[PDB]
């Protein structure tokens, strides 16, 4: 009986071919090389003493094309143009990337998942699955030198880039932009005091994962009880869960159909787990309720 | 303080080796290195003869024309075929232009590797897992995943250590090295087989507690130490592997980095086993995690890259 539901990232090859190193002064981070453009975080032009309140327009007054070193592997790419767009730079290079995949830039919404290719000095180190949290942070694994690492989904042969890495907040969660250079959430690329909102739990994702658990033979948490959307939402609020909407109930329809467990019966199971805990039991090898699988992730992994 | 994730190796070097192999109606995955495609030998089985297939006898009735190899949109001509233990080696007419630097390695229990899960010769996802002490792995494999490979990367070289063959009734997975030899006592027939005792990889749990301290989770640290002797008496009671001097030696670099003695961390683990977490979490788990090696921790916390 299948019971191996795991956190799974997209194969990283199509993205690996796009990673380069960008150096400005003594600051080295990663860039994304698509066609003849390299995208990177605009704070590549910052200096150590001016991180608190950089004036990016003022900082660009003293920057020429030759102040940007771009290296694809060990191949020097000549910068022939540079512009600032939102919180990214666009470096025009003399050579189009021959490994440019079919790609799109997409904006994700809270609750949606994506793969991160963590890189250092334009070289891939590892790949893992993230979700955009309700507070617009991600729980990544990023060190000094990881800025410019990207998050993506792969759909058919199309790479949808959704994330570029910029910063680490004091609770060790991560903030960044889409590939248009607009921050997720309220964050700014300066070292002024910023805090992640209270983390809340992605309720529609927890319910998808309880459906995964049923498909994978974990049934111990199923009960006779039904609830209402209103009464469930009173419990969600108390346990710092996101509201469950009728739109979420519609999104969970296919999983309720596949398992024959009504969405509001699975809500009754979740209510009983929040109120009573797990009584030293596990679900899909966790002692915690997992919220970083979407309904779409469960369907894809459980049936391909 | 900072984050620490189950991280897979980048998969690009492997994706360029995955092909589709069909024998009769059976389609699974193969590994295309130079002019050889490696796949599970049970590609030659029929549905009604899975209990005790005679592989030698099935295979003499096979010709090159019975093996259809496809790399993307491109049919490869099979020009030779041999059996090596539980894998076929299909000599093809075209050497794989995307063949990386590689070795075949057989990993030890407690060691970790990345799985590139593939279906119809197309890579679908990547995740990290460990060789369990019972020589199973806790993978995520559906119908069609057979021939998917596990690997590590060092510098620019891919070390292939696993090829997927089967799912046991508890939903754990069994397979071979790339010499075609199973990990553990498993055999590629549908005769009753069961995984042995699932024991916790103690040295890995200690590595993960060092990872937690590096990433600012300190609550489980106590001013206590234990002897190895006294720790292992407690380990036995909770189906933990005994901790050996070799394990203590491998944990030495994390002990030095954190300045927390290995036997101090053992005292923290003994308390966690005896008392639980009392509603706290370590690196966002409410369980003790055993699928990070000491090397995995250093690699992640020091940002080691590949090409
Ligand atoms: Na001792």
Curated annotation (Swiss-Prot), chain B:
Inhibited by pyridone-containing alpha-ketoamides compounds 13a and 13b. In turn, alpha-ketoamide 13b (tert-butyl (1-((S)-1-(((S)-4-(benzylamino)-3,4-dioxo-1-((S)-2-oxopyrrolidin-3-yl)butan-2-yl)amino)-3-cyclopropyl-1-oxopropan-2-yl)-2-oxo-1,2-dihydropyridin-3-yl)carbamate) inhibits SARS-CoV-2 replication in human lung cells. Inhibited ex vivo by michael acceptor inhibitor N3. Inhibited ex vivo by compound 11a and 11b. Changing residue 143 to A: Does not affect ability to cleave and inactivate human TRMT1. Residues 2-307 are cytoplasmic. It comes from the Viruses. Changing residue 50 to A: Does not affect ability to cleave and inactivate human TRMT1. It catalyses: TSAVLQ-|-SGFRK-NH2 and SGVTFQ-|-GKFKK the two peptides corresponding to the two self-cleavage sites of the SARS 3C-like proteinase are the two most reactive peptide substrates. The enzyme exhibits a strong preference for substrates containing Gln at P1 position and Leu at P2 position. There is a cross-link at residues 6, 91 (Glycyl lysine isopeptide (Lys-Gly) (interchain with G-Cter in ubiquitin)). It is found in: Host cytoplasm; Host Golgi apparatus; Host nucleus. Coiled coil: none annotated. Changing residue 206 to V: In strain: Zeta/P.2. Changing residue 146 to A: Complete loss of 3C-like proteinase nsp5 cleavage. Residues 2-307 form the Peptidase C30 domain. The active site is at residues 42, 146. Cleaves the C-terminus of replicase polyprotein at 11 sites. Recognizes substrates containing the core sequence [ILMVF]-Q-|-[SGACN]. Cleaves and inactivates human TRMT1, preventing tRNA guanine(26)-dimethylation of tRNAs. May cleave human NLRP1 in lung epithelial cells, thereby activating the NLRP1 inflammasome pathway. May cleave human GSDMD, triggering alternative GSDME-mediated epithelial cell death upon activation of the NLRP1 inflammasome, which may enhance the release interleukins 1B, 6, 16 and 18. Also able to bind an ADP-ribose-1''-phosphate (ADRP). 3CL-PRO exists as monomer and homodimer. Only the homodimer shows catalytic activity. Interacts with host FBXO22; this interaction promotes the proteasomal degradation of nsp5. This is 3C-like proteinase nsp5. It comes from Severe acute respiratory syndrome coronavirus 2.
């Amino acid at each position: 009986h299948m019971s191996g539901f795991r956190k799974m990232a997209f194969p990283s090859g199509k993205v690996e071919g796009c990673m380069v190193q960008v150096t400005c002064g003594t600051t080295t981070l990663n860039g994304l090389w698509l066609d003849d453009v390299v995208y990177c975080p605009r704070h590549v032009i910052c200096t150590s003493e001016d991180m608190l309140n950089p004036n990016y327009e003022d900082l660009l007054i003293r920057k020429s094309n030759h102040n940007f070193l771009v290296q694809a592997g060990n191949v020097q790419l000549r910068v022939i143009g540079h512009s600032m767009q939102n919180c990214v730079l666009k470096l025009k290079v003399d050579t189009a990337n021959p490994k440019t995949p079919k790609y799109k830039f997409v904006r994700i919404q809270p609750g949606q998942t994506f793969s991160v290719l963590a890189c250092y000095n334009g070289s891939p180190s590892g790949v893992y699955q993230c979700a955009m949290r309700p507070n617009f942070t991600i729980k990544g694994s990023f060190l000094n030198g990881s800025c410019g690492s990207v998050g993506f989904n792969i759909d058919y042969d199309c790479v949808s880039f959704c994330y570029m890495h910029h910063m680490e907040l004091p609770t060790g969660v991560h903030a960044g932009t889409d590939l248009e250079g607009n921050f997720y959430g309220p964050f700014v690329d300066r070292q002024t005091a910023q805090a992640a909102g209270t983390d809340t739990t992605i309720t529609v994702n927890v319910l998808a994962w309880l459906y995964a658990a049923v498909i994978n033979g974990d049934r111990w948490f199923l009960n006779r009880f039904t609830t209402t959307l209103n009464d469930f939402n009173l419990v969600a609020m108390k346990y710092n869960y996101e509201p469950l909407t009728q739109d979420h109930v519609d999104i969970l329809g296919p999983l309720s159909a596949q398992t024959g467990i009504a969405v509001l019966d699975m809500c009754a199971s979740l209510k009983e787990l929040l109120q009573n805990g797990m009584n030293g039991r596990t679900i899909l090898g966790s002692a915690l309720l997992e919220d970083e699988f979407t309904p779409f992730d469960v369907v894809r992994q459980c049936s391909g």
